[PDB]
Design a protein around this ligand. Sequence first.
Ligand SMILES: [K+]
Ligand SMILES: [Mg+2]
Ligand SMILES: [Mg+2]
Ligand SMILES: [Mg+2]
Lengths: 153, 290, 159, 67
Amino acid sequence: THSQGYRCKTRYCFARKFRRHGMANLTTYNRVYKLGQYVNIKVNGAYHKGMPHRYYNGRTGTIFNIGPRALGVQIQKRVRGRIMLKRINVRLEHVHPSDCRKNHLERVAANDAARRLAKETGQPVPCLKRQNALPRAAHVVSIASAIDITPLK
Amino acid sequence: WVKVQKTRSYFKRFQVQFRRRREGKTDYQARKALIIQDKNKYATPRYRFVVRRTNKDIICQVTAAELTKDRVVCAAYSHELPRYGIPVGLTNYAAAYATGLLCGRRLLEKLSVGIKENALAQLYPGLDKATGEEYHPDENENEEVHAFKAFLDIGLARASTGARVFAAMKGAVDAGLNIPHSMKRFPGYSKDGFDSSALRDRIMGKHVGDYMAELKAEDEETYRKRFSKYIAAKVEPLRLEAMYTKAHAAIRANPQAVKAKFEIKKPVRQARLTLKERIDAKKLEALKQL
Amino acid sequence: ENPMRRIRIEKLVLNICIGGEGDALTKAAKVLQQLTDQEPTFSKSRRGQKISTHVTVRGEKAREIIERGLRVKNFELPYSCFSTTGNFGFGITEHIDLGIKYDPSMGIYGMDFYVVLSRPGFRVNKRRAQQQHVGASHKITPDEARAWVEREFEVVYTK
Amino acid sequence: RASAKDYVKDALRRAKFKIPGRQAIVESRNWGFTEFTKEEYEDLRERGELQYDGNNAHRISRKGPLN
RNA sequence: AGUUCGGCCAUCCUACGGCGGAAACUCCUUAACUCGUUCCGAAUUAAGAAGAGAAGCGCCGUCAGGCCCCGCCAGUACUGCGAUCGGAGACGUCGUGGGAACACGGGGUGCCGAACU
RNA sequence: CCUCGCCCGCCCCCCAAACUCCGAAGGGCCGCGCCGCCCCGCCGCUGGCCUGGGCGGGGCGGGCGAAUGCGGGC
RNA sequence: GCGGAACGGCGUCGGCCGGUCCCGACAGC
RNA sequence: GCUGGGGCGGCGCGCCUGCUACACCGGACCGCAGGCGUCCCACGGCGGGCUCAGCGAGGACGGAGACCUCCCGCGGAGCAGA
Ligand SMILES: [K+]
Ligand SMILES: [Mg+2]
Ligand SMILES: [Mg+2]
Ligand SMILES: [Mg+2]
């Protein structure tokens, strides 16, 4: 039919991975979260309390509440021609920290370090801006070529 | 004609357990319950009092769980006891009490190494003498400084009435550690309170002395063969609580650890060689032989 | 050989399987308790009706019981009654032949004798912590068991 | 074998008229129903490297235990 | 080198042969006490120190099964965008982008951390 | 004692909208400027502690760190 | 130069793969 | 009332699982295979201990199956009803 129970159409997204059944490792409980941190949502099918809805599987958001046992996560959801901010409570088995800012943090650190380095020696500051791949430059190649031909059918 | 049970498909789909579970060392349910903390308490260390018992001695440790490992901040063993006045009878009830007391005193002294005012050692001085009664350090805890708190972890042992794990925990509590617990699993417990006399008797090895006396009294051959190490060192039933009290006083006086000396020995049993060219030779010869 | 490789009787299990609850079960359990000096236990059919009782005996008392039971059969047992794990058993028909004093009122009852052989160090497969399997060389094979039994209770076998 | 190879194609042409659509008749370069071309099959037979079954043939094994 | 407590959870598992113990771990001995087994000191609890590498454990081996990496499979199968391109249709083709799987061949077979001996 | 069957092993033809050990093209969500150092204050929360977390203040150094287009919001 | 299929054509043009042939093939030893 | 005219028949008229559905979410039909309007003071809470189905081998009034024992057993059992 068409019924829309809380867990409809979850035959594949809530199943365990191959040879990864059973209890979760203990790193999922003793890692530290702070307000404003970016996290990912991935549902674990062996834990049935604090489970988010199928819609939130594979989204990223920020922490707005640190609780005794659950976290509060803010997520942007599009509804028709508008975006709504949804706040949900998730238990620890369904949340992982997100590396969506690691590249920017490393870029900032490197930019500052390079700026410090050349100043002490006085060397000119290089360009600290990313470049989209530019066209190739002039160069010279050697020839030991192999003749290529088309085969018969 | 008999079907094969462990087939190739059996191996393809097999999932191994965690390594420490395969060796039967840790119960991961209990550990998860023990090391869980409120998320709004962030990276604040949480300590458990770990007690283990081998065939020859007793181990006491205070450890904190980290992200990628476990951190030990104090450990006491039953080897050290002869260094304090107890040469024999290790791994029995009195020895467990003594090792727990040693661990507690050593941890408190290490914590108060430098501090001068309100040091954790001056405040919360353990019970002056072992009386075998219910004592709780947190009763009337100092407001400015609270007592060190740990949680007891038993492992795979059976938590029965009269077990030595609880003896080690009682010894640790007598040194000034705040370990939550009741008095149900101690030898003096009844439906209405409990009597410190039985606990005191056990803590001082009265049962061992009585057994030694009765055995030597009438059946002396079995006594000689069954208490060879006791008899060799000249330990007699009547002069037993005195030695235990002297050991308690000595431990409570200077409870620090002196490093023992030794050198490691690596045999050849693990020195056998790992024989591609050499492996490839043992097939050509066998093929030619056949 | 190493002294740790020698065999001993590990346990002996006495079974009487006569269907239906009643003084038959009660009388059989009473006789089992009297013989073994150990209370028996009942087994429930798979439903919920008692059908049998049994008791396990360890130590030397098992050795004496087995000695008498073999005496019943004249130290003769088929060579093929040894299991692939190194165990064996037989079955008397009345308990009076064991040397027990007959009772007109108690009745008669057939019995099952199963005895398990073992070596020192089999504990590794039974303890609660660090449980493992015993090595293939330490296990008792049927031929070693037959040799030990024949050399122990003076038994001859018939093919 | 070579006896009935003179009429196999006519049998196939006869069967072609009961099937809808368009079909083609081909002669395989393989040996019978095996996966070996005739040249490869004959070579591997003159080199002693064929385990034989009631219909099919397979190359000798080079993995697993000996004996 | 060993043990206690851990992290990641097979390159660590499974089967079968072999090597080793000074210390350690283990196997071992006893049932007065403590506690214990639908019955059993088997398990478990308490108390020991005459034996032992025979197991468990550490290491080695196997044209080993499994697990892991690289190549080939193959620019193949499939596919996004554009086409008054072919064809009655079923389907195919061209231009411009992305790109497998099985099978098969070669090789490999636990590290990391804190405390004690 | 023979001769085919059921059973065990290998090999092999052909399959699945309600089979999947594997798995694209294609889609979806998030990020792409402020940073670093030092010191100070408050908490009735949190910790064995001189621990944390949160919210503020004061000094020092540095700086605008992909392309393309274009004013936005209620 | 009808909308159009299985299936036929010794109509014409163009190919691919095999034999025999001045040691005389094919069609009329 | 819906409705490949209406009637007769049926009830996608309140809910639930899998598929249809074309790898975020959404997605139609009187589309496909089905279910619900109940049952349980224990079939509920917590703690401890234990390991299931079954293959193989053995015990025999005892057999294709009762009960007993050892071995190996990644779940092939069980967890009220789809
Ligand atoms: K209509
Ligand atoms: Mg527990
Ligand atoms: Mg109407
Ligand atoms: Mg509606």
